[PDB]
Structures are given as C-alpha cells and as structure tokens.
Amino acid sequence: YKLICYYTSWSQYREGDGSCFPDAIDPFLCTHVIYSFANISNNEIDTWEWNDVTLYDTLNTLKNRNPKLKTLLSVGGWNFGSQRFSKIASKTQSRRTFIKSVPPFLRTHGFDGLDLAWLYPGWRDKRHLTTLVKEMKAEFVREAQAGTEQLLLSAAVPAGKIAIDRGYDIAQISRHLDFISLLTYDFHGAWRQTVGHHSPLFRGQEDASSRFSNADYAVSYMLRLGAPANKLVMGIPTFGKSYTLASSKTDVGAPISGPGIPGQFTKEKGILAYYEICDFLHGATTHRFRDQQVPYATKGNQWVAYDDQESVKNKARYLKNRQLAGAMVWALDLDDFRGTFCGQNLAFPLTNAIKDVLAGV
Numbered sequence: 001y002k003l004i005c006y007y008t009s010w011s012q013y014r015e016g017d018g019s020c021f022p023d024a025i026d027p028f029l030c031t032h033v034i035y036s037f038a039n040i041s042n043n044e045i046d047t048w049e050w051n052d053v054t055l056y057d058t059l060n061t062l063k064n065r066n067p068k069l070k071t072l073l074s075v076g077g078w079n080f081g082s083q084r085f086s087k088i089a090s091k092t093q094s095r096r097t098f099i100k101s102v103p104p105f106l107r108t109h110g111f112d113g114l115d116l117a118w119l120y121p122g123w124r125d126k127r128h129l130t131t132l133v134k135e136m137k138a139e140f141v142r143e144a145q146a147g148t149e150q151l152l153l154s155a156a157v158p159a160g161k162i163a164i165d166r167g168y169d170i171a172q173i174s175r176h177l178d179f180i181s182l183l184t185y186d187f188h189g190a191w192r193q194t195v196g197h198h199s200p201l202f203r204g205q206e207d208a209s210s211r212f213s214n215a216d217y218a219v220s221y222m223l224r225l226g227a228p229a230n231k232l233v234m235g236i237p238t239f240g241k242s243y244t245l246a247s248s249k250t251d252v253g254a255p256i257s258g259p260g261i262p263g264q265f266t267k268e269k270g271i272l273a274y275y276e277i278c279d280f281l282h283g284a285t286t287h288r289f290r291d292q293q294v295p296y297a298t299k300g301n302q303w304v305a306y307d308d309q310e311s312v313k314n315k316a317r318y319l320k321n322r323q324l325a326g327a328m329v330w331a332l333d334l335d336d337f338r339g340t341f342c343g344q345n346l347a348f349p350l351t352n353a354i355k356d357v358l359a360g361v
C-alpha cells in the first residue's frame with residue numbers, strides 16, 4: 001500500500017503549537033510525503049515561501065532516517081488557482097518551458113517526483129491537461145537516462161462527478177501517472193445552507209443525498225472511467241468542516257447561517273484541524289451518521305463534520321477491499337502531529353490508524 005501524505009508550507013506560521021515544520025514528521029509514518037505548494041514563475045517551477053529552500057532540505061533530511069521514503073513537490077494549489085495553470089498548459093511554448101524546468105529543480109532540491117495540483121481544469125482545459133501529463137511523463141522518462149531513478153508523477157483529482165467529467169480524461173492521464181490521489185473530502189461546504197458531511201464513505205438515505213456526493217461513488221466512477229485500481233489512492237482528511245447553526249436543530253438537514261468560527265490555531269472559518277477538534281469535543285455532543293459511516297459533533301451553535309480513528313480505519317479497510325493502491329492524507333499538519341491534544345499521547349493518531357490498517361492482512 002502507498003500512504004501518501006501532504007505537508008503544507010503555510011503550516012509553519014501558525015501560532016504556538018499549531019506551528020508545523022517538516023522535522024515534526026515521523027520518517028516512517030508515510031511512504032510518500034508531498035510538499036504543498038510550488039509556484040510557477042517565468043513559466044518555470046519555483047519556490048513559494050521565502051524559506052522553501054530550507055524546508056525542502058528539512059523534509060529531504062527525513063530520508064536520512066528512512067532512505068525508502070519518497071518525496072514529491074506539488075505544483076498548483078488553490079492560491080495559484082486555475083487560470084494561471086490554464087495559460088501554461090494550453091500553449092506549446094510555455095508548456096515546454098515549464099516541463100523542462102521541472103527535473104532540474106526537483107533534483108536540486110532532493111525531490112523524487114512531481115505532483116500536479118491544478119485546482120481545477122475547466123471544460124476547455126481537459127485536452128491540455130492530457131497533453132501536459134503525457135509530455136511531463138515523457139520528459140521524466142528521458143531524464144532517467146542520465147542514471148538516477150526516474151522521477152515520479154502524480155496528480156490530485158477532485159472527487160465530484162461534475163468536476164471529473166469537466167476537466168479530466170481519466171483513461172488517458174491514468175496511463176502516464178504513477179498514482180492519482182482522489183480528493184474524497186469535499187462533498188459538502190457552507191455553500192449549501194444546511195449541515196452535511198464532506199467526507200461520507202456512502203450515501204445518506206435519509207437525506208435525498210445526491211447519489212454522487214460520497215467516496216464510494218467517486219472511487220467506483222474513477223474505476224469505471226479507466227483508472228486502474230493499482231493507480232488510485234483514496235483521500236482521507238485529517239481536518240473537519242465547521243458550521244454555524246441557524247437554529248437549535250443539530251440533526252440531518254439542520255439549517256446553517258455560515259461557516260463555523262475559526263479555530264484557535266488554524267484561524268480559518270469553516271475548517272478545524274483534528275487537534276482542534278479533539279479540544280472541541282470536550283463538552284460536545286457526538287453523533288455518527290450510520291449509513292454514511294462518519295461522525296459529527298456539536299456544542300452551542302457550532303456543528304463540526306469530521307473524521308476520527310474509527311472512520312479513518314473504516315476508509316482504509318474499504319480501499320484495501322477495493323484493491324486500491326492506498327490512501328492519501330490531507331494533511332500531516334492538521335492531524336495531532338504533536339500528539340498532545342487527543343488524550344492519547346500519540347503523535348499522528350489519524351495517520352497512524354490508517355497506516356496500521358494498510359499494514360494488516
């Protein structure tokens with residue numbers, strides 16, 4: 001099994017214990033750590049944070065302890081956005097400048113591969129993405145001739161049917177990618193007006209839950225479209241999503257006025273780290289969605305959909321039963337990386353629960 005784990009470069013800045021640098025990562029926890037995100041500047045791959053050269057080195061030092069560990073650099077992300085990626089990929093000359101830039105940058109900085117995180121290609125982009133992936137892979141092939149182990153190529157792909165059909169020729173891109181991380185944790189958000197879970201494994205039968213907005217549906221679709229199981233990695237979140245409730249109702253379909261209040265550490269409305277959520281559960285009422293197989297919790301006017309040790313193990317058992325390549329984790333700096341929040345003196349509780357299932361059998 002692969003266990004693909006993202007480390008975000010902006011986590012460093014969080015206050016107090018929310019601060020996460022790459023030396024916090026257990027070298028043996030994941031098979032592959034992906035550093036998020038790289039820029040494109042002058043049509044070439046580039047650093048993002050002022051100190052990314054230092055933190056790339058911190059990350060790459062982890063291989064001293066675990067020489068089998070692989071690292072990738074993820075280019076794109078949401079601040080980068082779509083339109084910038086579109087401009088690069090749709091023209092022969094900028095595409096080539098970018099693709100040429102990648103192997104030398106990665107080798108300089110100690111990375112084993114590239115992760116493409118274009119969030120997200122429009123309908124006019126689907127064919128360019130195909131070309132980009134094929135051509136990037138071919139440049140990696142060529143570059144292996146010089147005697148170092150071929151660079152890995154991966155891609156982060158959204159899990160909604162609509163975004164998949166719009167942007168991605170899955171049958172073609174799966175031929176050239178070494179794995180595809182399926183983003184099976186954005187099925188609900190504050191744009192909806194009611195509470196709901198963003199990472200359910202199956203449909204909720206009570207709600208008239210659009211048949212597609214669940215991990216199983218997404219995995220089955222990707223397979224149906226031609227992604228080989230042995231390339232497909234299923235995403236599992238260590239964050240949860242929060243909502244502010246519009247009434248005393250807490251139940252399936254309960255109305256919301258907006259995203260939840262920001263976390264003490266993550267300081268972003270609508271999202272909490274798992275460490276934050278362990279704190280939130282003190283004095284919260286907990287519930288599980290039985291059909292969807294994922295928990296939520298509530299306290300005052302706040303309502304939080306999240307994943308716990310039991311739900312992440314459950315998702316790991318599912319992906320193994322479907323003979324998937326493994327799991328992806330968004331993100332290491334959102335699990336209880338310190339180990340001190342969740343009453344168990346155990347660093348990376350969610351990620352290690354996933355790991356221990358994937359090792360079992």
Ligand SMILES: *[C@@H]1O[C@H](CO)[C@@H](O)[C@H](O)[C@H]1NC(C)=O
Binds near residue numbers: 039049
């Ligand atoms: C990324 O590259 C763009 C385009 O060159 C540049 O304008 C921007 O400052 C860069 N972003 C960061 C954060 O480095």
